[PDB]
Design an enzyme around this catalytic site. Structure first.
Site, PDB file in Angstrom:
ATOM      1  CE1 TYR L  22      -3.799  -2.536   0.404  1.00 15.12           C
ATOM      2  CE2 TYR L  22      -2.676  -3.266   2.395  1.00 15.12           C
ATOM      3  CZ  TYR L  22      -3.668  -3.457   1.443  1.00 15.12           C
ATOM      4  OH  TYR L  22      -4.524  -4.548   1.527  1.00 15.12           O
ATOM      5  CG  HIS L  99     -10.601  -0.376  -3.491  1.00 17.32           C
ATOM      6  ND1 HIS L  99     -11.029  -0.445  -2.184  1.00 17.32           N
ATOM      7  CD2 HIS L  99     -11.698  -0.571  -4.257  1.00 17.32           C
ATOM      8  CE1 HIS L  99     -12.329  -0.677  -2.161  1.00 17.32           C
ATOM      9  NE2 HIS L  99     -12.762  -0.757  -3.405  1.00 17.32           N
TER      10      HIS L  99
HETATM   11  C1  XNW Z   1      -2.557  -1.891   6.546  1.00 23.24           C
HETATM   12  O1  XNW Z   1      -2.646  -0.952   5.474  1.00 23.24           O
HETATM   13  C2  XNW Z   1      -3.850  -1.069   4.802  1.00 23.24           C
HETATM   14  C3  XNW Z   1      -3.960  -0.385   3.620  1.00 23.24           C
HETATM   15  C4  XNW Z   1      -5.097  -0.413   2.836  1.00 23.24           C
HETATM   16  C5  XNW Z   1      -6.200  -1.121   3.208  1.00 23.24           C
HETATM   17  C6  XNW Z   1      -7.408  -1.042   2.270  1.00 23.24           C
HETATM   18  C7  XNW Z   1      -7.580  -2.239   1.344  1.00 23.24           C
HETATM   19  C8  XNW Z   1      -8.389  -3.312   2.071  1.00 23.24           C
HETATM   20  O2  XNW Z   1      -8.768  -3.160   3.235  1.00 23.24           O
HETATM   21  C9  XNW Z   1      -8.747  -4.587   1.338  1.00 23.24           C
HETATM   22  O3  XNW Z   1      -9.751  -5.290   2.103  1.00 23.24           O
HETATM   23  C10 XNW Z   1      -9.356  -4.207  -0.012  1.00 23.24           C
HETATM   24  O4  XNW Z   1      -9.507  -5.400  -0.792  1.00 23.24           O
HETATM   25  C11 XNW Z   1      -8.539  -3.141  -0.783  1.00 23.24           C
HETATM   26  C12 XNW Z   1      -8.272  -1.865   0.029  1.00 23.24           C
HETATM   27  O5  XNW Z   1      -9.530  -1.166   0.252  1.00 23.24           O
HETATM   28  C13 XNW Z   1      -7.344  -0.940  -0.788  1.00 23.24           C
HETATM   29  O6  XNW Z   1      -6.396  -1.489  -1.419  1.00 23.24           O
HETATM   30  O7  XNW Z   1      -7.646   0.285  -0.829  1.00 23.24           O
HETATM   31  C14 XNW Z   1      -6.123  -1.828   4.407  1.00 23.24           C
HETATM   32  C15 XNW Z   1      -4.960  -1.808   5.208  1.00 23.24           C
END
Ligand code: XNW
Ligand code: XNW
Ligand code: XNW
Ligand code: XNW
Ligand code: XNW
Ligand code: XNW
Ligand code: XNW
Ligand code: XNW
Ligand code: XNW
Ligand code: XNW
Ligand code: XNW
Ligand code: XNW
Lengths: 141, 141, 141, 141, 141, 141, 141, 141, 141, 141, 141, 141
Positions: L22, L99
């Site tokens: 991310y 996303h």
């Molecule tokens: C721990 O850092 C994070 C970063 C992004 C997310 C969001 C993503 C997510 O929760 C997944 O369930 C979804 O499939 C995609 C997501 O919403 C994203 O890539 O923005 C969660 C934790």
């Protein structure tokens, strides 16, 4: 004239174990009933049981070479074995599939058979008499 | 003592039409064979055929009220009718499902039956003799 | 140098039975052709057949320990055996899957193989020559 | 008192081959750890391994007749064998399913077990210790 | 005598791009190897490549009219084109499907081919040699 | 050293309600057994339960930051929550999934877990002792 | 010479009800158009409608015995009746399936027909003229 | 003002047979309760039952022409009949679907209805009172 | 007035190749029949065939701009092309889909069309006359 | 005597937002109607709404401990929450599932409920009156 | 520096046809907006459109050889073309997939893309601005 | 003017944890970038994050009442929550789904969204800039 009855895995435990699902008739007692019924019909029944796929395949091979009919209760292999089906596809005389329990009232995996599509016909759920009724079919054909 | 044989849609065309799929034995001739076999077994066979679901349901209703066994070849309704199954669920005596052809060697829609799961057992692919073998089962039970 | 050709259930019936699906070449004759082709290529072919899964697994175990290539026609076990696949996953030298018939023109269950995904490559439908062409691949790699 | 540990196909290759998927502990070493842990628990462990389904079925048959618990790692047969399940359905004492690797993190075909639904419980992915923890469960029940 | 090798979309990028998936042999180099192998076999190989479905169809049309065999690697069209299959259904001489990579070890969409069911046979995963081995099959048939 | 045991929705009703599915041991009693077993193993167990997903996520966040192992019985969220899985994917120390009941013998929706694929391993159907056996695994790793 | 047009359930409500889905032409008016078109073609059209499956089966039986062609719009039974299909399989002269509405633009259950696979051909979505165009086909064959 | 209650196959056997699934209230007794409840609500209830699809369709046709509401328990036809749905699609006044048993707690085939999507609403599992509650809905709308 | 008949891949091989599946009428002969029938109807038919999707799209584009009806037999693209469907969605005048063979009696992939849902109607299995009957529909609308 | 009405996520927005899907009756107004109807029936209705799963679970827990009936409209959680179902499985008094809209006429995901199989019965599509009719059922049971 | 914008089938009809689905901006006008936005960002945009797959593949080939980024709206080929995906897999610089309409609110076949899994990212439903926003992403990376 | 950016579960862990999936940008830093970009665009951005569904629903409720646009990254709830979708269906101003990661290149469960079908559009895989590009869309609409 000669009819081969072939039983697959676990069928040697018949009668001794769970009478509720499969009846209280044992495998030796099944052999005796089959033999007696065959004589009454003018046939000879050769009854064989194995837990080993290789052994079942050999017995099917011999029925294929001798042009003899087969009554087959393959047990669990009914639902799983392509090799058993390939061996049965060589039979030129009738193949009757027999199951003691009604497989269509049980788990979904018991409702598919690799053997049913190449068998002459199929008897299920009529218990031990299933074998006897298959003999009678062969006698009148 | 009394066994009801119930045939569904199209079974009145037996023998007259395609002998290759179902044999050259006609429906009247089937009735005669069934009756003769029943007598030999010490039973009475009452054989009925209809193309009408309502009629088949009425005949099943009467077997339910009289506590009598049923040998049922529902024809196409075997694969399609929930109502026929609901009527058969009321039967306290045995239900034997019979099909002349081996439905498991034909189109996929013929390999599902609404009746198989609630039937005592199922005979398929043994032709007309299927009915006779079902009678013999009932005679020894 | 050494190439192991391993045949599974029913492959011992080759040639003797149905020539139409698999050709009129017998298993002993297949062995002889393989051996001759191997010599011409500068290889030694060791050809083994069994109807017993346990035996096939042992032969795969030995090829894994000896670091030797395998040409495998597992018969019906191709579509059914996870154990055979687990044994083949240990092979460090190439695995070539071979089938005599074109399994992709037959029943849907023949179009899935537990072995294809871990094999180097797959030859099907080219008959007995399939084995010979797999040898030639191994010779030039 | 007596606990039967039954290992299926390929489990004899443990430790010697791929340590990365299953650990560097060999099958003989697994037997020794199991035996030692059992003694410490006040139990006797009888550990058996085969690549042959027939042999596994016989060992399950004996546990059924002796009313003894079974810890079973059926290997590839876990996902494929109805016969193995039929044999296990006869067990009156607990059946604990054990897998060394986490089958739920691997190919989709490893995520279905014919044994899980009739087992008391299931341990996966905890390596060799899986067997030891299953022993401890049996000791306190 | 004359064998047509037909390559579909993207196969002109061979060797120049990703050597890891498909090898470092270029398309011109593939042509040269094929030609040389054909001569050694007593055949003439005519090798054609296009990214255009229409062009591939025309080349298949000509092989159908000339009664000539085809070795076909249709690239992505293998999994997608009904039109390509309809054109290939007209071929009276053998059709051998060839893929460089093992499509059965890749994405699920690569494991279905519209061509496999009507092909004589299929070679996959043996790299560029796949084409050469298909030639040898045609030479001995 | 420190092991976090995290229980999800409905697990506070343990023992007080249906003893038949989950046993007569209450949640406070479960905490006491876990604590005692942990001490015996040389560990400290911190046991937390919530019906609130947000709270469970916070507790997983803290275990991720502290580099501590987690034993997780997420209750119904096991089958439904992607967010819970995303939080667990951050854990660098082992994750052991535990269920009291054998979820593989129950409704089909209980046989899928979002957590199983990223967990070190999974224990199900061994009741309350499941937690204790997971502790012992962590102690020896 | 003689063409049987058979309409199934609900087709008697034509024109009187929803003109938007099926047009403002009534069933009697449909009969008149069919008759007139038939005369112009040198044919005789016999047009029958029933909400009763049994009645439709009888009418198909008679066309089978008389060796006469059938134009069939079975209404809802198109998607549901195996019995109707079994009756139609006996027809030796052409069967043309006709639907007023474009069933392929409607609910998914309307996109499957038990009749399409055994019909000579199928016309849908061309409204009432569908019947007239089917007549013209029969006239030129 | 006038409400039509229409019952399909097997509903005439109510109360007389299995009280456990559907209650001990008979069909005549159901009629009497419905009539009494209707009067109390200021409505007239016309209650009809048939095992014949054709008859049910006619009764739906009449409600469509008279612009009258329908309370429909189609029995097995609920899950199987497209024709019944086509007839119900013509109704301009409300259609309330009623089932005595909770179809969503029974076999999977009972959990699909061709009628639910075009009905105003659906009441299931509340027994005979289901009909009475549907009347009350119609009274206040 | 002007009707565009558009044929896709392989339709230029008509009549010359397999008469058994598609008839002995060639593409030029099809053009002549279409033209003659159109004149008799007071229409002008413009008949075009290509193996190239791009070309078919251009021809559909022109019919969209000219507000002219289209009779379309897209060949294999019927089952595969979303682009062809997107182009056809722009047509404001009727689209009639035509297939020579009965696609519903052939492989399952031929029973899905991207065009059927947006077409006015569909004629299949009536051979070459299919086109002529589509013309007649357009003439009377 | 005491009936708990429990509303899940988004149900507090009732009436204020989209009247077209759910009616113009607000949540406070729903509470008042429910209370008034309950009094008329001799019952006490306790009506609670939350967007928080944890809160809904607590309210279900209390109804389980007090042996009180529940009328439950879980909103979106109806289709998604296993935890909600686990909590409802503890209820010994009746559970009536209520939905304002006809979920069976909407997106496919609304046609599956985790609650329907364990509920006494289900009312959908009858609007706000659904709740009132569920009260009346409880009053007469 | 250089960004290639590639549009597939039907995208040349933009703006001129249906403004409701895709907006009233034409393809030439789209080119002008893209060019202007690119200049403002310090980039050069090269915008190409074709209805021909072969042409699109060539343009992707050139971007692969030049190491240049691609913004790709493949039209219908998005859902159908494996060849297009194979060509895009060679790109070492970013691939941004763009669709004007929200494909996830349309037919189910539009919700699958062969390109999405290998693309850097995907923008859909933001209309023509989608392209402009993709440019801005490339500018800041 | 006012744009609400709403982040669901786990998004508070951004940047601090896994930078590889991310990016290394934290949630506070994301807020600052969003605010700055909004000002530059002439907008005000209100950025909120919660691990609690109830809280997210409240924030969506307020945007619905204030007629304000929403940029929503619901985290795991994207794939699981019907309640979140029901709340979003009330929004009259645009909903942009964002996303960070390319969900279409990850596990199959991430490739389904309950939000995509009712959103104006969707941006995925463009990292943190996704939010900024969504702002720019809102600014020019
Ligand atoms: C721990 O850092 C994070 C970063 C992004 C997310 C969001 C993503 C997510 O929760 C997944 O369930 C979804 O499939 C995609 C997501 O919403 C994203 O890539 O923005 C969660 C934790
Ligand atoms: C322990 O007594 C047994 C009795 C019958 C069987 C045979 C049955 C079997 O093995 C199942 O796998 C199969 O689905 C049905 C079976 O072949 C039968 O009911 O005849 C096995 C063990
Ligand atoms: C025209 O002669 C007939 C003979 C048997 C049947 C009965 C068969 C039938 O109706 C099929 O729908 C079913 O799949 C099998 C069948 O019941 C049988 O083979 O007994 C029908 C017509
Ligand atoms: C009786 O002659 C035989 C010839 C080949 C085979 C092998 C084939 C086989 O066992 C099938 O289960 C499999 O699908 C294909 C097979 O392995 C082959 O065609 O090589 C078996 C028996
Ligand atoms: C070569 O070392 C081996 C180690 C374990 C196993 C057993 C595993 C197995 O056979 C797989 O088919 C199964 O999916 C899981 C397995 O039973 C295990 O991980 O315990 C096999 C070979
Ligand atoms: C860029 O080098 C290439 C090499 C081989 C191919 C052909 C392969 C292909 O196009 C895939 O769509 C297909 O699944 C397999 C393929 O036909 C092959 O491996 O021969 C394409 C491009
Ligand atoms: C009321 O006593 C309870 C006991 C255990 C559980 C946990 C179980 C659960 O919530 C199910 O959703 C799940 O499928 C299995 C479960 O997590 C378990 O058996 O441990 C819940 C309530
Ligand atoms: C009330 O006017 C009607 C008109 C046509 C039909 C026939 C149609 C039918 O019954 C549907 O079940 C079927 O899917 C299509 C239908 O047969 C037709 O459009 O011709 C029924 C009623
Ligand atoms: C023999 O007493 C009966 C009672 C109710 C019914 C009606 C039920 C029925 O026919 C099933 O096919 C259906 O799934 C549910 C049913 O309509 C009901 O429970 O009301 C049938 C027979
Ligand atoms: C070689 O003669 C041909 C005749 C018809 C067709 C058209 C048919 C076709 O291409 C199939 O892909 C399709 O499923 C049916 C077809 O469009 C037809 O039967 O009209 C193709 C080749
Ligand atoms: C904004 O007004 C609302 C009204 C009813 C509902 C409840 C409905 C719901 O949440 C859906 O998820 C469900 O599929 C049906 C629902 O529970 C109902 O129609 O009662 C939600 C919001
Ligand atoms: C006639 O104006 C058009 C506008 C956009 C498109 C492109 C769209 C397309 O071709 C569909 O196959 C696809 O599902 C979505 C599409 O690529 C888009 O919305 O950008 C096609 C024709």
């Amino acid at each position: 004239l000669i009819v081969n009855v072939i039983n697959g895995p676990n069928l040697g435990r018949l009668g001794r174990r769970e009478p509720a699902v499969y009846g209280g008739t044992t495998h030796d007692e099944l052999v005796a009933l089959i033999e007696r019924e065959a004589a009454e019909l003018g046939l000879k029944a050769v009854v064989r049981q194995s837990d080993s796929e290789a052994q079942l395949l050999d017995w099917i091979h011999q029925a294929a070479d001798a042009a003899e009919p087969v009554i087959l209760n393959a047990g669990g292999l009914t639902h799983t074995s392509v090799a058993l089906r390939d061996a049965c596809a060589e039979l030129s005389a009738p193949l009757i599939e027999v199951h003691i329990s009604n497989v269509h009232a049980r788990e979904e995996f018991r409702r598919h058979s690799y053997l049913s599509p190449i068998a002459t016909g199929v008897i299920v759920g009529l218990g031990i008499q299933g074998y006897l009724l298959a003999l009678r079919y062969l006698a009148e054909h």
